[PDB]
């Protein structure tokens, strides 16, 4: 189902990586954030919601969604309540970049454009079909 996303943080090199997965397609978005915080999660969701039709969000750590900032974002945006494979791609391109955040975006790109249709194509097809 096309409005469902998964959202979790992983850790790498002492930093936090917020990873959203469009469950039906396997498409990902990710950002490196300073701290694993309710506020950062909220802002992330705002950005995600303006880009895709986000209806429901799941997580492996329910306590992530407990902050008032997060609930307020989900309220405003109308939302209701890979990390190993990505680390793999991060590892493969890590040395081409100085900043971890740059390596993460390189990795997100590679993940979304690979065929094994790519995740990037499937999200768009699934969502266009739903219109």
Binding site for a second copy (CB under 8 A): 29, 43, 46-47, 49-53, 76-77, 101-102, 105-106, 108-109, 112-113, 117, 120-121, 124-125, 127-129, 131
Cα–Cα distance, 129 to 131 (Å, whole number): 6
Query: Both tokens of residue 78?
Result: 């109308």
Residues that bind Mg ion (CB under 5 A): 8-9, 38, 61, 67-69
Helices (H), the chain: 38-51, 68-77, 83-93, 100-113, 119-130
Burial of 67 (0-12, 13-18, 19+ CB in 10 A): middle
Q: Which does 116 bind (CB under 5 to 8 A by kind): Mg ion, ligand 9VK, a second copy, none?
A: none
Q: Which is nearer to a second copy, 23 or 127 (CB)?
A: 127
x-or-dash pattern for ligand 9VK, window 30-69, by CB under 6 A? Answer: ---------x--xx--x---------------------xx
CA 16 to the chain's CA centroid: 12
Q: How far is the CB of 87 from a second copy (least distance, A)?
A: 16
Size of the residue set binding ligand 9VK (CB under 6 A): 14
**Residue 85 contacts by C-beta under 8 Å, 6 or more apart in sequence?**
111
Q: What are phi and psi of 30, to 5 degrees?
A: -155, 150
Residue 48's nearest CA partner among 6, 91, 89 is 6
Residue ranges in 83-112 that form contacts with ligand 9VK under rule CB under 6 A: 96-99, 102
Binding site for ligand 9VK (CB under 6 A): 39, 42-43, 46, 68-69, 72-73, 76, 96-99, 102
């Amino acid at each position: 189902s096309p409005g469902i996303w998964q959202l979790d943080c992983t850790h790498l090199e002492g930093k936090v990586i917020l990873v959203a997965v469009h469950v039906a397609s396997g498409y990902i978005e990710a950002e490196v954030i300073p701290a694993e915080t309710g506020q950062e999660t909220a802002y992330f969701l705002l950005k995600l919601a303006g880009r895709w039709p986000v209806k429901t969000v799941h997580t492996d750590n329910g306590s992530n969604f407990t902050s008032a900032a997060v609930k307020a974002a989900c309220w405003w945006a109308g939302i209701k309540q890979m990390n190993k494979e990505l680390k793999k791609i991060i590892g493969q391109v890590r040395d081409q970049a100085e900043h971890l955040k740059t390596a993460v975006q390189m990795a997100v790109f590679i993940h979304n454009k690979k065929r094994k249709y790519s995740a990037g194509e499937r999200i768009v097809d699934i969502i266009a079909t739903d219109i």
